[PDB]
PDB file of all heavy atoms in Angstrom:
ATOM      1  N   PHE F 346      -6.003 -17.907   7.754  1.00  0.00           N
ATOM      2  CA  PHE F 346      -5.436 -16.933   8.733  1.00  0.00           C
ATOM      3  C   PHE F 346      -4.208 -16.246   8.146  1.00  0.00           C
ATOM      4  O   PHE F 346      -4.115 -15.016   8.159  1.00  0.00           O
ATOM      5  CB  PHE F 346      -5.032 -17.678   9.999  1.00  0.00           C
ATOM      6  CG  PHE F 346      -4.241 -16.913  10.943  1.00  0.00           C
ATOM      7  CD1 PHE F 346      -4.831 -15.791  11.528  1.00  0.00           C
ATOM      8  CD2 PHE F 346      -2.946 -17.219  11.230  1.00  0.00           C
ATOM      9  CE1 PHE F 346      -4.097 -14.986  12.409  1.00  0.00           C
ATOM     10  CE2 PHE F 346      -2.172 -16.437  12.127  1.00  0.00           C
ATOM     11  CZ  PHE F 346      -2.807 -15.334  12.681  1.00  0.00           C
ATOM     12  N   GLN F 347      -3.309 -17.022   7.501  1.00  0.00           N
ATOM     13  CA  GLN F 347      -2.093 -16.449   7.017  1.00  0.00           C
ATOM     14  C   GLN F 347      -2.413 -15.577   5.746  1.00  0.00           C
ATOM     15  O   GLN F 347      -1.868 -14.436   5.652  1.00  0.00           O
ATOM     16  CB  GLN F 347      -1.073 -17.572   6.626  1.00  0.00           C
ATOM     17  CG  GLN F 347       0.160 -17.083   5.946  1.00  0.00           C
ATOM     18  CD  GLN F 347       1.215 -16.338   6.781  1.00  0.00           C
ATOM     19  OE1 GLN F 347       0.994 -15.995   7.942  1.00  0.00           O
ATOM     20  NE2 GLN F 347       2.337 -16.037   6.167  1.00  0.00           N
ATOM     21  N   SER F 348      -3.158 -16.027   4.869  1.00  0.00           N
ATOM     22  CA  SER F 348      -3.506 -15.367   3.573  1.00  0.00           C
ATOM     23  C   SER F 348      -4.353 -14.113   3.821  1.00  0.00           C
ATOM     24  O   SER F 348      -4.161 -13.137   3.124  1.00  0.00           O
ATOM     25  CB  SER F 348      -4.102 -16.328   2.578  1.00  0.00           C
ATOM     26  OG  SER F 348      -5.533 -16.505   2.891  1.00  0.00           O
ATOM     27  N   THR F 349      -5.168 -14.121   4.853  1.00  0.00           N
ATOM     28  CA  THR F 349      -5.897 -12.900   5.192  1.00  0.00           C
ATOM     29  C   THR F 349      -4.935 -11.884   5.703  1.00  0.00           C
ATOM     30  O   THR F 349      -5.108 -10.690   5.361  1.00  0.00           O
ATOM     31  CB  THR F 349      -7.001 -13.119   6.258  1.00  0.00           C
ATOM     32  OG1 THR F 349      -7.964 -14.044   5.818  1.00  0.00           O
ATOM     33  CG2 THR F 349      -7.752 -11.853   6.609  1.00  0.00           C
ATOM     34  N   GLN F 350      -3.909 -12.233   6.464  1.00  0.00           N
ATOM     35  CA  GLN F 350      -2.925 -11.322   6.930  1.00  0.00           C
ATOM     36  C   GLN F 350      -2.117 -10.726   5.781  1.00  0.00           C
ATOM     37  O   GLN F 350      -1.893  -9.527   5.704  1.00  0.00           O
ATOM     38  CB  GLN F 350      -1.992 -11.903   7.951  1.00  0.00           C
ATOM     39  CG  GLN F 350      -2.602 -11.828   9.352  1.00  0.00           C
ATOM     40  CD  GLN F 350      -1.690 -12.614  10.358  1.00  0.00           C
ATOM     41  OE1 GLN F 350      -0.924 -11.949  11.038  1.00  0.00           O
ATOM     42  NE2 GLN F 350      -1.848 -13.850  10.372  1.00  0.00           N
ATOM     43  N   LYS F 351      -1.698 -11.538   4.805  1.00  0.00           N
ATOM     44  CA  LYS F 351      -0.910 -11.120   3.684  1.00  0.00           C
ATOM     45  C   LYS F 351      -1.675 -10.236   2.707  1.00  0.00           C
ATOM     46  O   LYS F 351      -1.090  -9.236   2.266  1.00  0.00           O
ATOM     47  CB  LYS F 351      -0.324 -12.397   2.939  1.00  0.00           C
ATOM     48  CG  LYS F 351       0.622 -13.164   3.678  1.00  0.00           C
ATOM     49  CD  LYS F 351       1.970 -12.449   3.814  1.00  0.00           C
ATOM     50  CE  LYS F 351       3.129 -13.315   3.388  1.00  0.00           C
ATOM     51  NZ  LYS F 351       3.223 -13.426   1.854  1.00  0.00           N
ATOM     52  N   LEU F 352      -2.892 -10.554   2.420  1.00  0.00           N
ATOM     53  CA  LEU F 352      -3.646  -9.766   1.534  1.00  0.00           C
ATOM     54  C   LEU F 352      -3.957  -8.415   2.114  1.00  0.00           C
ATOM     55  O   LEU F 352      -3.992  -7.394   1.418  1.00  0.00           O
ATOM     56  CB  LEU F 352      -4.976 -10.476   1.180  1.00  0.00           C
ATOM     57  CG  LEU F 352      -5.824  -9.792   0.164  1.00  0.00           C
ATOM     58  CD1 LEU F 352      -5.167  -9.596  -1.157  1.00  0.00           C
ATOM     59  CD2 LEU F 352      -7.140 -10.614   0.066  1.00  0.00           C
ATOM     60  N   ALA F 353      -4.286  -8.321   3.465  1.00  0.00           N
ATOM     61  CA  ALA F 353      -4.452  -7.062   4.118  1.00  0.00           C
ATOM     62  C   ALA F 353      -3.175  -6.204   4.052  1.00  0.00           C
ATOM     63  O   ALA F 353      -3.286  -5.003   3.803  1.00  0.00           O
ATOM     64  CB  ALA F 353      -4.893  -7.277   5.540  1.00  0.00           C
ATOM     65  N   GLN F 354      -2.049  -6.819   4.280  1.00  0.00           N
ATOM     66  CA  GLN F 354      -0.782  -6.104   4.175  1.00  0.00           C
ATOM     67  C   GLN F 354      -0.546  -5.645   2.715  1.00  0.00           C
ATOM     68  O   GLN F 354      -0.063  -4.525   2.546  1.00  0.00           O
ATOM     69  CB  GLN F 354       0.426  -7.039   4.581  1.00  0.00           C
ATOM     70  CG  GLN F 354       1.799  -6.405   4.624  1.00  0.00           C
ATOM     71  CD  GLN F 354       2.941  -7.284   4.477  1.00  0.00           C
ATOM     72  OE1 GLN F 354       4.065  -6.933   4.062  1.00  0.00           O
ATOM     73  NE2 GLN F 354       2.690  -8.590   4.794  1.00  0.00           N
ATOM     74  N   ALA F 355      -0.849  -6.466   1.779  1.00  0.00           N
ATOM     75  CA  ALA F 355      -0.697  -6.055   0.339  1.00  0.00           C
ATOM     76  C   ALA F 355      -1.664  -4.964  -0.052  1.00  0.00           C
ATOM     77  O   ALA F 355      -1.298  -4.083  -0.817  1.00  0.00           O
ATOM     78  CB  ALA F 355      -0.789  -7.273  -0.580  1.00  0.00           C
ATOM     79  N   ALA F 356      -2.807  -5.001   0.601  1.00  0.00           N
ATOM     80  CA  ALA F 356      -3.797  -3.943   0.277  1.00  0.00           C
ATOM     81  C   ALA F 356      -3.331  -2.602   0.885  1.00  0.00           C
ATOM     82  O   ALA F 356      -3.457  -1.568   0.252  1.00  0.00           O
ATOM     83  CB  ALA F 356      -5.118  -4.264   0.866  1.00  0.00           C
ATOM     84  N   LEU F 357      -2.785  -2.656   2.102  1.00  0.00           N
ATOM     85  CA  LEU F 357      -2.233  -1.531   2.708  1.00  0.00           C
ATOM     86  C   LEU F 357      -1.054  -0.887   1.968  1.00  0.00           C
ATOM     87  O   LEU F 357      -0.986   0.311   1.706  1.00  0.00           O
ATOM     88  CB  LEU F 357      -1.638  -1.933   4.107  1.00  0.00           C
ATOM     89  CG  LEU F 357      -2.362  -1.354   5.335  1.00  0.00           C
ATOM     90  CD1 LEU F 357      -1.568  -1.562   6.607  1.00  0.00           C
ATOM     91  CD2 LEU F 357      -2.714   0.163   5.170  1.00  0.00           C
ATOM     92  N   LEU F 358      -0.130  -1.726   1.509  1.00  0.00           N
ATOM     93  CA  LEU F 358       1.012  -1.279   0.712  1.00  0.00           C
ATOM     94  C   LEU F 358       0.611  -0.773  -0.640  1.00  0.00           C
ATOM     95  O   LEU F 358       1.234   0.207  -1.162  1.00  0.00           O
ATOM     96  CB  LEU F 358       2.021  -2.483   0.508  1.00  0.00           C
ATOM     97  CG  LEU F 358       2.868  -2.771   1.762  1.00  0.00           C
ATOM     98  CD1 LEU F 358       3.763  -3.994   1.561  1.00  0.00           C
ATOM     99  CD2 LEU F 358       3.734  -1.556   2.075  1.00  0.00           C
ATOM    100  N   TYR F 359      -0.413  -1.250  -1.253  1.00  0.00           N
ATOM    101  CA  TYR F 359      -0.938  -0.828  -2.605  1.00  0.00           C
ATOM    102  C   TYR F 359      -1.446   0.558  -2.309  1.00  0.00           C
ATOM    103  O   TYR F 359      -1.160   1.489  -3.140  1.00  0.00           O
ATOM    104  CB  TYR F 359      -2.056  -1.733  -3.090  1.00  0.00           C
ATOM    105  CG  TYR F 359      -2.605  -1.212  -4.361  1.00  0.00           C
ATOM    106  CD1 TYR F 359      -2.226  -1.749  -5.564  1.00  0.00           C
ATOM    107  CD2 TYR F 359      -3.561  -0.213  -4.372  1.00  0.00           C
ATOM    108  CE1 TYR F 359      -2.713  -1.348  -6.801  1.00  0.00           C
ATOM    109  CE2 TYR F 359      -4.062   0.194  -5.586  1.00  0.00           C
ATOM    110  CZ  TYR F 359      -3.663  -0.334  -6.780  1.00  0.00           C
ATOM    111  OH  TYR F 359      -4.268   0.081  -7.931  1.00  0.00           O
ATOM    112  N   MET F 360      -2.274   0.759  -1.275  1.00  0.00           N
ATOM    113  CA  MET F 360      -2.736   2.174  -1.026  1.00  0.00           C
ATOM    114  C   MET F 360      -1.630   3.139  -0.623  1.00  0.00           C
ATOM    115  O   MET F 360      -1.667   4.325  -1.047  1.00  0.00           O
ATOM    116  CB  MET F 360      -3.877   2.146   0.009  1.00  0.00           C
ATOM    117  CG  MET F 360      -5.117   1.451  -0.443  1.00  0.00           C
ATOM    118  SD  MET F 360      -6.428   1.439   0.719  1.00  0.00           S
ATOM    119  CE  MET F 360      -5.784   0.444   2.040  1.00  0.00           C
ATOM    120  N   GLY F 361      -0.748   2.690   0.186  1.00  0.00           N
ATOM    121  CA  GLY F 361       0.378   3.493   0.743  1.00  0.00           C
ATOM    122  C   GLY F 361       1.344   3.878  -0.357  1.00  0.00           C
ATOM    123  O   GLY F 361       1.801   5.018  -0.399  1.00  0.00           O
ATOM    124  N   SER F 362       1.606   2.948  -1.250  1.00  0.00           N
ATOM    125  CA  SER F 362       2.494   3.253  -2.356  1.00  0.00           C
ATOM    126  C   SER F 362       1.846   4.159  -3.376  1.00  0.00           C
ATOM    127  O   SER F 362       2.566   5.072  -3.895  1.00  0.00           O
ATOM    128  CB  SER F 362       2.801   1.923  -3.092  1.00  0.00           C
ATOM    129  OG  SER F 362       3.670   2.174  -4.214  1.00  0.00           O
ATOM    130  N   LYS F 363       0.589   4.015  -3.638  1.00  0.00           N
ATOM    131  CA  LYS F 363      -0.091   4.875  -4.524  1.00  0.00           C
ATOM    132  C   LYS F 363      -0.106   6.290  -3.994  1.00  0.00           C
ATOM    133  O   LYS F 363       0.218   7.281  -4.755  1.00  0.00           O
ATOM    134  CB  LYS F 363      -1.533   4.452  -4.759  1.00  0.00           C
ATOM    135  CG  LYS F 363      -2.329   5.306  -5.669  1.00  0.00           C
ATOM    136  CD  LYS F 363      -3.731   4.810  -5.873  1.00  0.00           C
ATOM    137  CE  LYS F 363      -4.589   5.882  -6.508  1.00  0.00           C
ATOM    138  NZ  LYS F 363      -4.157   6.141  -7.915  1.00  0.00           N
ATOM    139  N   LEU F 364      -0.456   6.413  -2.706  1.00  0.00           N
ATOM    140  CA  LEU F 364      -0.508   7.795  -2.112  1.00  0.00           C
ATOM    141  C   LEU F 364       0.896   8.468  -2.008  1.00  0.00           C
ATOM    142  O   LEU F 364       1.058   9.630  -2.276  1.00  0.00           O
ATOM    143  CB  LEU F 364      -1.177   7.750  -0.760  1.00  0.00           C
ATOM    144  CG  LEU F 364      -2.717   7.572  -0.804  1.00  0.00           C
ATOM    145  CD1 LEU F 364      -3.292   7.154   0.565  1.00  0.00           C
ATOM    146  CD2 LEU F 364      -3.431   8.797  -1.251  1.00  0.00           C
ATOM    147  N   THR F 365       1.868   7.714  -1.551  1.00  0.00           N
ATOM    148  CA  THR F 365       3.199   8.122  -1.384  1.00  0.00           C
ATOM    149  C   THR F 365       3.836   8.585  -2.701  1.00  0.00           C
ATOM    150  O   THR F 365       4.521   9.602  -2.784  1.00  0.00           O
ATOM    151  CB  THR F 365       4.094   6.998  -0.752  1.00  0.00           C
ATOM    152  OG1 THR F 365       3.557   6.763   0.562  1.00  0.00           O
ATOM    153  CG2 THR F 365       5.436   7.437  -0.565  1.00  0.00           C
ATOM    154  N   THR F 366       3.543   7.834  -3.770  1.00  0.00           N
ATOM    155  CA  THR F 366       4.024   8.143  -5.043  1.00  0.00           C
ATOM    156  C   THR F 366       3.382   9.470  -5.607  1.00  0.00           C
ATOM    157  O   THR F 366       4.064  10.146  -6.362  1.00  0.00           O
ATOM    158  CB  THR F 366       3.732   6.966  -5.977  1.00  0.00           C
ATOM    159  OG1 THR F 366       4.421   5.812  -5.440  1.00  0.00           O
ATOM    160  CG2 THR F 366       4.288   7.250  -7.403  1.00  0.00           C
ATOM    161  N   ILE F 367       2.142   9.662  -5.381  1.00  0.00           N
ATOM    162  CA  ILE F 367       1.493  10.886  -5.824  1.00  0.00           C
ATOM    163  C   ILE F 367       2.212  12.082  -5.158  1.00  0.00           C
ATOM    164  O   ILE F 367       2.567  13.035  -5.827  1.00  0.00           O
ATOM    165  CB  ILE F 367      -0.023  10.941  -5.323  1.00  0.00           C
ATOM    166  CG1 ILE F 367      -0.887  10.049  -6.223  1.00  0.00           C
ATOM    167  CG2 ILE F 367      -0.627  12.399  -5.380  1.00  0.00           C
ATOM    168  CD1 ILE F 367      -2.253   9.801  -5.730  1.00  0.00           C
ATOM    169  N   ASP F 368       2.456  12.028  -3.791  1.00  0.00           N
ATOM    170  CA  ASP F 368       3.153  13.101  -3.029  1.00  0.00           C
ATOM    171  C   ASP F 368       4.595  13.360  -3.578  1.00  0.00           C
ATOM    172  O   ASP F 368       5.030  14.430  -3.709  1.00  0.00           O
ATOM    173  CB  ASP F 368       3.216  12.791  -1.541  1.00  0.00           C
ATOM    174  CG  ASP F 368       1.924  13.079  -0.828  1.00  0.00           C
ATOM    175  OD1 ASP F 368       1.363  14.098  -1.122  1.00  0.00           O
ATOM    176  OD2 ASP F 368       1.566  12.333   0.036  1.00  0.00           O
ATOM    177  N   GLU F 369       5.335  12.261  -3.816  1.00  0.00           N
ATOM    178  CA  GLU F 369       6.700  12.363  -4.274  1.00  0.00           C
ATOM    179  C   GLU F 369       6.707  12.918  -5.772  1.00  0.00           C
ATOM    180  O   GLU F 369       7.744  13.573  -6.121  1.00  0.00           O
ATOM    181  CB  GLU F 369       7.437  11.005  -4.170  1.00  0.00           C
ATOM    182  CG  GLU F 369       7.706  10.266  -5.418  1.00  0.00           C
ATOM    183  CD  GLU F 369       7.967   8.707  -5.252  1.00  0.00           C
ATOM    184  OE1 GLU F 369       8.027   8.196  -4.021  1.00  0.00           O
ATOM    185  OE2 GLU F 369       8.091   8.119  -6.265  1.00  0.00           O
ATOM    186  N   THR F 370       5.680  12.618  -6.520  1.00  0.00           N
ATOM    187  CA  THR F 370       5.643  13.096  -7.870  1.00  0.00           C
ATOM    188  C   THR F 370       5.405  14.576  -7.960  1.00  0.00           C
ATOM    189  O   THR F 370       5.946  15.260  -8.784  1.00  0.00           O
ATOM    190  CB  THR F 370       4.538  12.344  -8.631  1.00  0.00           C
ATOM    191  OG1 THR F 370       4.969  11.026  -9.007  1.00  0.00           O
ATOM    192  CG2 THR F 370       4.182  13.118  -9.987  1.00  0.00           C
ATOM    193  N   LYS F 371       4.572  15.138  -7.062  1.00  0.00           N
ATOM    194  CA  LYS F 371       4.397  16.553  -6.951  1.00  0.00           C
ATOM    195  C   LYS F 371       5.653  17.288  -6.562  1.00  0.00           C
ATOM    196  O   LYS F 371       5.981  18.286  -7.134  1.00  0.00           O
ATOM    197  CB  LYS F 371       3.235  16.883  -5.922  1.00  0.00           C
ATOM    198  CG  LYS F 371       1.930  16.509  -6.473  1.00  0.00           C
ATOM    199  CD  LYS F 371       0.712  16.902  -5.546  1.00  0.00           C
ATOM    200  CE  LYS F 371      -0.584  16.234  -6.056  1.00  0.00           C
ATOM    201  NZ  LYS F 371      -1.723  16.614  -5.223  1.00  0.00           N
ATOM    202  N   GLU F 372       6.440  16.691  -5.626  1.00  0.00           N
ATOM    203  CA  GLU F 372       7.715  17.261  -5.227  1.00  0.00           C
ATOM    204  C   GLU F 372       8.802  17.187  -6.264  1.00  0.00           C
ATOM    205  O   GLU F 372       9.628  18.070  -6.421  1.00  0.00           O
ATOM    206  CB  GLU F 372       8.283  16.696  -3.904  1.00  0.00           C
ATOM    207  CG  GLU F 372       7.344  16.880  -2.671  1.00  0.00           C
ATOM    208  CD  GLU F 372       6.925  18.305  -2.452  1.00  0.00           C
ATOM    209  OE1 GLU F 372       7.700  19.149  -2.019  1.00  0.00           O
ATOM    210  OE2 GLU F 372       5.675  18.589  -2.709  1.00  0.00           O
TER     211      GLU F 372
END
């Protein structure tokens, strides 16, 4: 239960960071 929540959060942050960093790099 706990590790499924953490891995989902980490997967979210990995995608969010990747996308956010692409946008900030263009600017």
Side-chain angles (χ1 to χ4, degrees):
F346 172 65
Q347 174 74 353
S348 76
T349 300
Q350 276 175 96
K351 292 291 231 74
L352 183 62
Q354 188 202 157
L357 252 192
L358 283 175
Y359 180 99
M360 293 182 293
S362 179
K363 180 180 167 67
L364 285 165
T365 297
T366 301
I367 286 169
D368 282 319
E369 105 201 356
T370 286
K371 291 181 189 183
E372 299 309 288

